[PDB]
From a paper:
Mitoribosomes of green algae display a great structural divergence from their tracheophyte relatives, with fragmentation of both rRNA and proteins as a defining feature. Here, we report a 2.9 Å resolution structure of the mitoribosome from the alga Polytomella magna harbouring a reduced rRNA split into 13 fragments.
Further data processing and classification revealed distinct classical and hybrid tRNA binding states, supporting the engagement in active translation. All bacterial protein homologues are conserved with the exception of the universally lost bS20, and the functional sites for mRNA and tRNA binding remain largely unaltered. In addition to fragmentation of the rRNA, we also noted three occurrences of protein fragmentation in the conserved bacterial homologues uS3m, uS4m and uS7m, each one of which is split into two nuclear-encoded fragments. We found that the rRNA contains a non-canonical reduced form of the 5S, as well as a permutation of the LSU domain I. The mt-5S rRNA is stabilised by mL40 that is also found in mitoribosomes lacking the 5S, which suggests an evolutionary pathway. Finally, in the exit tunnel, mL128 constricts the tunnel width of the vestibular area, and mL105, a homolog of a membrane targeting component mediates contacts with an inner membrane bound insertase.
Numbering used by the authors:
A (entry chain Xd): 63 to 217
B (entry chain Xc): 37 to 93
C (entry chain AB): 114 to 163
D (entry chain Aa): 57 to 362
Write the structure that this text describes.
RNA sequence: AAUCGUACCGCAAACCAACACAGGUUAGUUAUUGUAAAGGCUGUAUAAAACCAGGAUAAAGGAACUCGGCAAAAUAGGUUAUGUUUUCGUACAAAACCACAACAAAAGUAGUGACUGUUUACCAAAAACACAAGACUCUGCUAACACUUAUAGUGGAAGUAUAGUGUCUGAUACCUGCCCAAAGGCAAAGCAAACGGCAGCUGUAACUCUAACGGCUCUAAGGUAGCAAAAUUCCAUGGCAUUUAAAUGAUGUCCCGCAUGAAUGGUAUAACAACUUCUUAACUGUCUCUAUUCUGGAUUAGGCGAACUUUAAAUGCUUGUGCAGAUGCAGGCUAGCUAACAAGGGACGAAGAGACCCUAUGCAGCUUUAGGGCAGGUUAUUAUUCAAUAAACUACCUUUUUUCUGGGACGGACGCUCUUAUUAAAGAAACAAGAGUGAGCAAUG
RNA sequence: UUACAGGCAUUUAAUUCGAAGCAUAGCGAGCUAACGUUUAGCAGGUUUGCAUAAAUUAAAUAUAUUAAAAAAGCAAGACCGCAAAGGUUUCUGUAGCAAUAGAA
């Protein structure tokens, strides 16, 4: 063995928690996880169109509560802080007064929400105080942003 | 050859075939149309003169 | 022997080998369609007519 | 070994000696099925199926078994190697038929269970069974040719065939024309059996076998007189390795046999072993073909390493 | 009972070949004794050159032609008493006899393969491959082996040692000898119908010659039978016989044969062959030696209308000269002008940046006991209830394989000193010549 | 020393044009090679080994049998040969009718 050999073993580290980004959910729990951790409206719309019939009360509530976070403000209405990172109660930017949402996101959010509101009414009697509180909070956020004008189920 | 279908298997499958039945009218004469559960094509099978509704012919 | 007769027309062969239904059945065929849409060719497949 | 004196004599009955009228008939020797009473027509409709020829191509479409294809239409027969279904019911032989897919003869047997319709089955024909004979299986059957019994009820010296390795899967061992196996001794839960190849093996006593031999004693006297005779059976010609070019075979070069004989993939073919040394089935083989003890084969390269 | 096809071309000027292309293109039907129903199609104007192509006839001779009976011609067909050879089925010779008009083409000898078959589309159809058949080896069934990332799946085979995988020989008849040392491979410490090998010197019988018969050396073993101037022979056209008026030819035979030889088989063999060799019969324009003629082209006239090529041209001979063979330079000659029909000496004539040879920062494929690697299988060791490591065998990946040289190869050479010729300052080359050296000494300082 | 103009050098497709080739990804078996399923074709003649019937036809008619193309078949990698599939030899053609054809 004229040419001596050295062997190294390299382990490929991976994230501990799975981000449901590409795979299709195939179970009750998987569908909930994909909806909760959705990153874009196109992903949430895709999930609803494909797995529309495999929805329950919890799935509808989760989709509504996460929609406000998927609507982003204009980059021209945000100012970035110097070196600040996301933390508990601290964001890397501060908002100018009366910030406006992105031009191309309003029609998507309005269309997606209309479909959700259509199929929700049958589930109104199976809600808990936690679910009711989250729905009220989500709609208030959806009104501050130019997505809705009133909450049909407020009464 | 790991895939062979013998005549006994052919007859068992034929006897375990399901159909969807529909009554139609043609020129004033009633016919029965059927569709195999695994296919999307309909066909006219027989007339009411040769078939007794309510049984398993 | 005389050469130059490598083409023996057959309508059924032409549709099955290069048809639109065939191009849409595989991932590589779908990419070929996109490439032709990007270049902007007026006819996409030999199978197309109005 | 074929010799031209054998064909000139024209002695053995049951063979067709074709007169040398043409170059393709001079050395041709066949079997006369009519003189033997063997049916050579179409198989039973309810026990046969027509299938396409594969020509040695797998589901990927590539050639995996060389020198096949181009024969006549293929029809397959369903043969019941395990007669456990009809244990108690006696059967009557209707015909003895020829099958081009095997070297033995098949027998058509009709059963008449009480309170049911007749049942037809195919069985591997024993050596001395003709039409009209009665075949029986299961407990309470005589030790005669054509009877199927478990190894616990068979004498030591009686030849047997169609032996089952597993208790109920079916006979697999002895099937070829004019072959048989013998039982040497029976232990607590196994019997020592000598196979047609000369191998001594352990077989569970609950397996079944058929008394007698296989039913074709003229297999080795056949001579195909033409190349086209085996083409009709579905065999294609093959080319010698030293006749090819270097990129095709290890023997391709202009010189003949520059290196020791080997397969197309470079493996020595004049004595190199191919069975796995650590095969799990070594626990059931006592002596291999030729008299080699199992331990000698199992531990041969381990001593050289040491 | 709805829906789609129905025109026209379809052996063709409409389809595949860039074309109105002498090429390619499937099936179904029809008249006709020596003939032939229906239907379908149609060519610028002439002729009394050479020459070319495709036919016809020919005095006397009949292979004298030629590398070679190439091409052409030829009673070609049927039935035979008798003889020969056979693998007993065949095949061949044969005086003679028999034919309405049409159709018509040998036998023997040797070499090689048994045979019918298959092959380099576009220069090779064969003695090359395949083949029935013989032998060797592996495989106990979740078989060996192959495809695949395989943990799948599939072929083998739904077959089971009288079966399946791989290898070399190649119908059939008679045969098939010795060696497993060294270096490898495989295996049960053995294996050659696995890959391979199978000597030399010297003395001797009446006169001579030869050596039946001795002596010595060495090796794992020392080539046995058979055959042999070969499809194998350098001397060579070997010696003898037959064949011719004449024999580098053919057949037979003699034979340690540069370098024959027994399953990379040895010696024979009826039949078969658009294979190679020689001979016989007959026939003939192949030839002595050519002549005449028919059809078409050329050639003449009208119409239509290409291509290779072109530095510029108003473009003689001869000797001399010269990058060493001159239309163009020097001497000696050459004086009506432009073309047509015809021939093919020169313009180192045209076509394709020489293939041969040598030279590259060369490229590619193939081979191996040239270097390195392990990444599939097998094998070995170890560990958990389809794994990890590798100086092994198979498969695969990647890299290396100087220059000088009276062309390259082959051979020889490459460091460092002394001497010879090119005079008596130094220096100075060639695969010029004649000699040394890769140290020694504890004293030889 | 800094700036500017010039000459030369280094690095980056770096004066222009030109290989045989190497690597990665896709499109091809309507030509051809082997194979699968279905379908169709091969005039007219010749030689040879076998084959008998719901009860073959006649005579014998018992016994013993006999005669007859009395067979609407199988077998041959069989023979001479029209179609067809080939490409042995010669000649013509050689940017040709044709990037492989024509006649025998
Ligand atoms: K072979
Ligand atoms: K070789
Ligand atoms: K033939
Ligand atoms: K060999
Ligand atoms: K030939
Ligand atoms: K000239
Ligand atoms: K020279
Ligand atoms: Mg070759
Ligand atoms: Mg004459
Ligand atoms: Mg002469
Ligand atoms: Mg031959
Ligand atoms: Mg032939
Ligand atoms: Mg050729
Ligand atoms: Mg030939
Ligand atoms: Mg040729
Ligand atoms: Mg032989
Ligand atoms: Mg030899
Ligand atoms: Mg030979
Ligand atoms: Mg003219
Ligand atoms: Mg001159
Ligand atoms: Mg001059
Ligand atoms: Mg050049
Ligand atoms: Mg050199
Ligand atoms: Mg024939
Ligand atoms: Mg050919």
């Amino acid at each position: 063995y004229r040419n001596k050999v050295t062997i190294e073993y390299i382990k490929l580290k991976e994230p501990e928690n799975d981000d449901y980004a590409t795979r299709d959910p195939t179970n009750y729990a998987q569908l909930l996880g994909a909806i909760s951790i959705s990153r874009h409206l196109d992903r949430t719309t895709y999930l609803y169109e494909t797995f529309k019939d495999k929805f329950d009360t919890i799935h509808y509530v989760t989709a509504l509560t996460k929609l406000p976070g998927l609507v982003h403000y204009r980059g021209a209405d945000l100012v970035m802080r110097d070196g600040v990172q996301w933390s508990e109660g601290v964001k890397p930017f501060w908002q100018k007064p009366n910030a406006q949402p992105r031009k191309h996101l309003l029609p998507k959010a309005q269309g997606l929400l209309s479909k959700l509101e259509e199929q929700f009414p049958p589930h109104l009697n199976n809600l808990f105080p936690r679910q009711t509180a989250n729905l009220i909070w989500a709609y208030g956020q959806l009104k501050r942003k130019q997505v809705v004008a009133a909450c049909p189920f407020l009464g | 050859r790991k895939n062979i279908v013998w005549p006994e298997q052919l007859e068992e499958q034929k006897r375990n075939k399901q159909y969807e039945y529909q009554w139609v009218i043609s020129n004033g004469k009633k016919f029965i149309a059927r569709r195999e559960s695994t296919s999307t094509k309909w066909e006219i099978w027989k007339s009411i003169e040769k078939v007794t509704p309510g049984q398993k012919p | 022997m005389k050469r130059g007769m490598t083409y023996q027309p057959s309508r059924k062969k032409r549709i099955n080998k290069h048809g639109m239904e065939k191009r849409l059945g595989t991932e590589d065929g779908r990419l070929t369609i996109l490439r032709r849409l990007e270049k902007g060719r007026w006819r996409l497949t030999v199978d197309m007519f109005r | 070994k074929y010799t031209y004196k054998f064909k000139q004599a024209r002695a053995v009955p049951g063979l067709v000696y074709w007169k040398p009228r043409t170059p393709g008939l001079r050395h041709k020797i066949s079997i006369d099925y009519d003189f033997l009473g063997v049916y050579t027509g179409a198989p039973h409709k309810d026990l046969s199926a027509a299938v396409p020829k594969l020509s040695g191509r797998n589901n990927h479409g590539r050639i995996t078994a060389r020198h096949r294809g181009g024969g006549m239409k293929k029809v397959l027969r369903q043969v019941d190697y395990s007669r456990e279904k009809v244990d108690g019911i006696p059967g009557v032989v209707e015909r003895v038929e020829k099958d081009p897919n095997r070297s033995g003869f098949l027998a058509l047997v009709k059963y008449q269970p009480e309170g049911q319709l007749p049942i037809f089955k195919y069985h591997l024909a024993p050596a001395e069974i003709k039409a009209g004979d009665v075949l029986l299986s299961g407990d309470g059957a005589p030790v005669q040719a054509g009877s199927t019994l478990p190894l616990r009820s068979i004498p030591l010296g009686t030849p047997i065939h169609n032996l089952e390795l597993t208790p109920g899967k079916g006979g697999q061992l002895a099937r070829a024309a004019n072959v048989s196996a013998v039982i040497q001794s029976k232990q607590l839960e196994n019997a020592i059996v000598k196979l047609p190849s000369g191998e001594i093996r352990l077989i569970n006593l609950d397996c079944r076998a058929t008394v007698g031999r296989v039913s074709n004693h003229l297999q080795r006297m056949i001579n195909y007189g033409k190349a086209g005779e085996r083409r009709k059976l579905g065999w294609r010609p093959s080319v010698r390795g030293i006749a090819k070019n270097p990129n095709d075979h290890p023997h391709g070069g202009r010189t003949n046999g520059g290196r020791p004989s080997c397969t197309p993939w470079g493996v020595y073919c004049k004595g190199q072993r191919t069975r796995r040394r650590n095969n799990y089935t070594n626990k059931f083989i006592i002596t291999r073909k030729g008299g080699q003890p199992i331990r000698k084969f199992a531990e041969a390269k381990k001593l050289k390493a040491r």
